[PDB]
Amino acid sequence: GETITLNLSEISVKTLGLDGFNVNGKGVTQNRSATVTDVIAQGGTLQGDGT
Amino acid sequence: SYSQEQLDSVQGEINQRLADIDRISEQTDFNGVKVLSDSAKPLTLQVGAND
Known about the structure:
This is part of a larger assembly, with two copies of chain A (51 residues).
Chain A: H1 36-41
PDB class: structural protein
Keywords: Bacterial flagella, motility, soil, structural protein
Entry title: Cryo-EM structure of the Achromobacter flagellar filament
């Protein structure tokens, strides 16, 4: 009727939360400015003054 | 000076000690008597003849 539960589990990568810990890499990527080609590729409409 | 997590570990040890105290209470047995429990009436120990 008596026990001493240990409650031991889950010490590893993928449970300490890192799971992908990547000190290097692209960091913060910089997007490129859009232009008329991209917008007309999205298929909308143009009008006066290029709007 | 102790941050919250060290207090959490301290409280974990407090809970372990309190649970052990309760275990001692409910498991200290003598001739099938939970002597140091919450249900242990005082004993008689008849000493001498002529009760």
